Swiss-Prot record:
The chain holds residues 2390 to 2706 of 2710 of the full protein. Belongs to the clostridial glucosylating toxin (LCGT) family. It comes from the Bacteria. Cell wall-binding repeats lie at residues 1-18, 50-69, 70-89, 91-110, 112-131, 163-182, 183-202, 204-223, 254-273, 274-293, 296-315. This is Toxin A.
Length: 317
């Protein structure tokens, strides 16, 4: 093979016959440049191919900074290239590399990415080209790209007909319609108005504001209780409670109590629930920092010292 004899570059095949072109070595594939090419080089010698682009009667490859034959998955000038990593020809198509199933276009040798329809089956890939298991956006909506053998069992990475049922994956919550596609926005599913991230079908969790109105969701659904906000603790009430709001819609609620489901709170003028020791009506209350829920029903340890409260939360001294 790459056997230098008398200060040259002698390459021989399996039976040992001279070779002409670009052949493999301890450094890599090098061009046996004719005479002359660089610094008066001999015939069939390899020396310098510094930072250019090579072609050999059909095959091609890109060269990098170190003058040596660079190979692998690349992204030069915003352009991705993948020429045979350890050979002169080309390797594309599915390639399970270290657990990750990458795919490479058989035409342009570029790591196909995003919602791509391969062989009549549309998979999904991130910007790194890695196979992204999960629920991602398509021209027709969000398709669940499930593991191997699922719905009328399939292959790992192929969307499946996932109809009229919720997806838990895992903390993430979704819901698919009849069209097998995920739901987005405000969706009454079995009587219950949900809301799904238009950007990721993610059933919304946490504090939210939509069309000038605040809601505190959890698992797609707006929640009913006193939860924290951008301005502190607000009451996210049922529909109709005040100014005919909708369920779990924060509401103006100033200077007054509310008994909500075996918990109790105080709201002030601003319409936020209070926190820490507080004397209302000449009755001492302590409402938890992180809950606003009054301490009641009994013994509570507060700042290292324990207090007994009544069912109504008033500290019995």
């Amino acid at each position: 093979g790459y056997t230098s004899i008398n200060g040259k570059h002698f390459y021989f095949n399996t039976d040992g016959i001279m070779q002409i072109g670009v052949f493999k070595g301890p450094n890599g594939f090098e061009y046996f440049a004719p005479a002359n090419t660089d610094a008066n080089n001999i015939e069939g010698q390899a020396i310098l191919y510094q930072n250019k682009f090579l072609t050999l009667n059909g095959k091609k490859y890109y060269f990098g900074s170190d003058s040596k034959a660079v190979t692998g998955l690349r992204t030069i000038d915003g352009k991705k290239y993948y020429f045979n990593t350890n050979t002169a020809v080309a390797v594309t198509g599915w390639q399970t590399i270290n657990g990750k199933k990458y795919y490479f276009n058989t035409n342009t040798s570029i790591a196909s990415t995003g919602y791509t329809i391969i062989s009549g089956k549309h998979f999904y890939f991130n910007t790194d080209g890695i196979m992204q298991i999960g629920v991602f956006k398509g021209p027709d909506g969000f398709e669940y790209f499930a593991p191997a053998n699922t719905d009328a069992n399939n292959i790992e990475g192929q969307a499946i007909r996932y109809q009229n049922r919720f997806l838990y994956l895992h903390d993430n919550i979704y819901y698919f319609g009849n069209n097998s596609k995920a739901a987005t926005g405000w969706v009454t599913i079995d009587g219950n108005r949900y809301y799904f991230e238009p950007n990721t079908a993610m059933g919304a969790n946490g504090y939210k504001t939509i069309d000038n109105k605040n809601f505190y969701f959890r698992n797609g659904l707006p929640q009913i209780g006193v939860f924290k906000g951008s301005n502190g603790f607000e009451y996210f009430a049922p529909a109709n409670t005040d100014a005919n709001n909708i369920e779990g819609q924060a509401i103006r609620y100033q200077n007054r109590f509310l008994h909500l489901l075996g918990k109790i709170y105080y709201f002030g003028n601003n319409s936020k629930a209070v926190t820490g020791w507080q004397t209302i009506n000449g009755k001492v209350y302590y409402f938890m920092p992180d809950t606003a829920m009054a301490a009641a029903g009994g013994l509570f340890e507060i700042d290292g010292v324990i207090y007994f409260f009544g069912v109504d939360g008033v500290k019995a001294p």
